[PDB]
Each structure stands twice: as structure tokens, then as C-alpha cells.
């Protein structure tokens, strides 16, 4: 609930990130650091318990999907 470095996300689309083959290579309290063994991309989803819009997620999908 800040206005800086808000990478926090909570959405069903995070599950898609898992199903795409992204693996948690670095475990953190809230921030899940995912790496896909094919593309040089690192996706970090900090997942709290809260209804969060996909506004940041669709930005993640740019790195996670492309």
C-alpha cells in the first residue's frame, strides 16, 4: 500500500506463472523469485493475503509470458 517499489501482487495469474514452468530458485518470506529454464528472465512475485489488482501482474506477464 505504498507508492514505490510496489511489486506486491495477489492474483490467479500468479498460478499461471507456476504452470508455465517458472521455478522458485530463491525463497523469500513474501517475494517469490522465479526463473524459467529457457529464458534469461527473473520474475519476483511478493504474494501477501490481499485482493490485489492485476495492474502490476500484467507487467509481470510481459516478462513471464514473453
Automatic annotation (TrEMBL):
SUPFAM superfamilies given for it? YcfA/nrd intein domain
Q: Which UniProt keywords apply?
A: Endonuclease, Hydrolase, Nuclease, RNA-binding, Stress response, Toxin-antitoxin system
Q: Which residues form a coiled coil?
A: none
List every stretch annotated Disordered.
31-50
The residues that cross the membrane are none
Enumerate the GO terms in the molecular function aspect.
endonuclease activity; hydrolase activity; mRNA binding
Instruction: Give the Pfam families listed for this entry.
Output: HicA_toxin
What family does this belong to? Answer: Belongs to the HicA mRNA interferase family.
Q: What name does this protein carry?
A: Addiction module toxin, HicA family
Question: Organism source for this protein?
Answer: Burkholderia pseudomallei (strain K96243)
Amino acid at each position: 500500500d505504498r507508492t514505490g517499489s510496489e511489486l506486491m501482487n495477489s492474483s490467479k495469474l500468479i498460478r499461471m506463472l507456476e504452470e508455465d514452468g517458472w521455478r522458485l530458485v530463491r525463497v523469500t518470506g513474501s517475494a517469490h523469485h522465479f526463473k524459467h529454464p529457457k529464458k534469461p528472465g527473473l520474475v519476483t512475485v511478493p504474494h501477501p493475503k490481499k485482493d490485489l489488482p492485476i495492474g502490476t501482474v500484467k507487467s509481470i506477464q510481459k516478462s513471464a509470458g514473453l
